[PDB]
């Protein structure tokens, strides 16, 4: 199951470490590609996430940055019509 918020984002807690195999643009504010860029997570780097979201065509993970701000990044596609996931863009440990 998933919790749901006022933007219709499906979300819950999950804690793991994600290492992308390609550069990924990270977002502030929320799990949408239209949100501002926080930075770039380079292939091979690792973030430790505490939240997972289904929104805007993707599964996103959320973490807290060094400035105390929330950061959001997409790790694979999510087709809401079928609840089908795409290939993971890296590895999770």
């Amino acid at each position: 199951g998933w919790k749901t918020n006022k933007y219709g984002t499906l979300y819950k807690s999950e804690s793991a470490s994600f290492t992308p195999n390609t550069d990924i643009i990270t977002r502030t504010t929320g799990p949408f590609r239209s949100m501002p860029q926080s930075g770039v997570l380079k292939a091979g780097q690792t973030i430790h996430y505490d939240e997972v979201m289904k929104q805007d065509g993707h599964v996103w993970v959320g973490y807290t940055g060094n400035s105390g701000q929330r950061i959001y990044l997409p790790v694979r596609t999510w087709n809401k019509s079928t609840n089908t996931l795409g290939v993971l863009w890296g590895t999770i440990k």
């Binding site: 918020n5 933007y7 984002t9 929320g30 939240e51 979201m53």
Partner: peptide, 5 residues
């Protein structure tokens, strides 16, 4: 939770 938008 789940951020904003």
């Amino acid at each position: 939770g789940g951020g904003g938008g």
